Amino acid sequence: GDTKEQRILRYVQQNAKPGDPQSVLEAIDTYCTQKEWAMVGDAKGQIMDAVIREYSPSLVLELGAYCGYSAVRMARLLQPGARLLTMEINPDCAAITQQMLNFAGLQDKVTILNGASQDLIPQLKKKYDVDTLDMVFLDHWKDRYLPDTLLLEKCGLLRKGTVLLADNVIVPGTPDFLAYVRGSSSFECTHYSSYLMKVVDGLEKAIYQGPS
Ligand SMILES: Cc1nc(C)c(-c2cc(C(=O)N3CCN(c4ccccc4)CC3)n[nH]2)s1
Numbered sequence: 001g002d003t004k005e006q007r008i009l010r011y012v013q014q015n016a017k018p019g020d021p022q023s024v025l026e027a028i029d030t031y032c033t034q035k036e037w038a039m040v041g042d043a044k045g046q047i048m049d050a051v052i053r054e055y056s057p058s059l060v061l062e063l064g065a066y067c068g069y070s071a072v073r074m075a076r077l078l079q080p081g082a083r084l085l086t087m088e089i090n091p092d093c094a095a096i097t098q099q100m101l102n103f104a105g106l107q108d109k110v111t112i113l114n115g116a117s118q119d120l121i122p123q124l125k126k127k128y129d130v131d132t133l134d135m136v137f138l139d140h141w142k143d144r145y146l147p148d149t150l151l152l153e154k155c156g157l158l159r160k161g162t163v164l165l166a167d168n169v170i171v172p173g174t175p176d177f178l179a180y181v182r183g184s185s186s187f188e189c190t191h192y193s194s195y196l197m198k199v200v201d202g203l204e205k206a207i208y209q210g211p212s
C-alpha cells in the first residue's frame with residue numbers, strides 16, 4: 001500500500017533534514033505545491049506563527065493532526081516545557097504524525113491522542129492531567145467546531161484569554177461556529193483572510209472571556 005500521506009512523509013525523509021522543523025515545513029509546502037496537494041499552507045502558517053508568538057501558550061490543543069504539518073509548525077515555536085496535544089481520529093494518520101514529529105525532532109513536545117475529539121476532550125482532565133488550555137487550533141471536521149467549543153466550555157477547559165484559532169472557517173466554512181463566537185460575549189473574534197484553489201478562505205481567532 002502507498003497512500004498520499006506515506007508519500008509526504010517519504011518526501012520529507014529524503015529532502016528535509018532530521019531535527020529541523022522548518023525544512024520539514026518547506027519540504028511539505030514544496031511537496032503539496034509541486035507534486036500532489038493535501039488538506040497545508042505557508043500563508044496560513046504565517047498567521048498560525050504570529051498567534052503562537054503573540055500569546056506564548058504553555059499548553060496547546062490541536063483538533064486534527066492529519067499528517068503533522070500544523071503540529072510541526074506549532075510545536076517548533078513552543079517554549080521549553082510547553083506541550084502540544086494533538087487529536088487524530090484515523091490511526092494511519094496518527095502514525096504518519098508520530099514519524100513526522102520524530103523526524104523533525106519534536107516528538108517530546110507533542111502527545112498524540114487517537115480518537116474522535118468529543119471522546120477525548122472529556123478525558124483531558126482526568127487522563128492527560130490538563131487543567132485549562134492556553135490555545136486551541138481547530139482543523140478537524142467543520143461541523144464539530146461549534147459543538148467541540150461548547151464541549152470544551154462544559155468540561156471547564158477554556159479560561160479567560162484562551163485563544164481558539166479556527167481554520168477553514170470560510171471554505172468549506174463554519175457558519176454556525178462563526179455566528180456563535182462573534183455573537184457571544186464570551187468570545188472576542190478576529191477574522192484573518194488567507195487565500196488558498198485560488199479562493200479566499202480565512203481563519204477565525206476567538207478569545208474566550210469567561211462564561212456568560
Ligand atoms: C470528530 C473528530 N475528531 C478528530 C480528532 C477528527 C480528525 C480530523 C482529522 C483531520 O486532520 N482531517 C483532515 C484531513 N481529512 C481529510 C482529507 C482528505 C479527504 C478526506 C478527509 C480528514 C480530517 N483527523 N482527525 S474528526
Ligand SMILES: [Cl-]
Pocket residue numbers: 116
Ligand atoms: Cl464520530
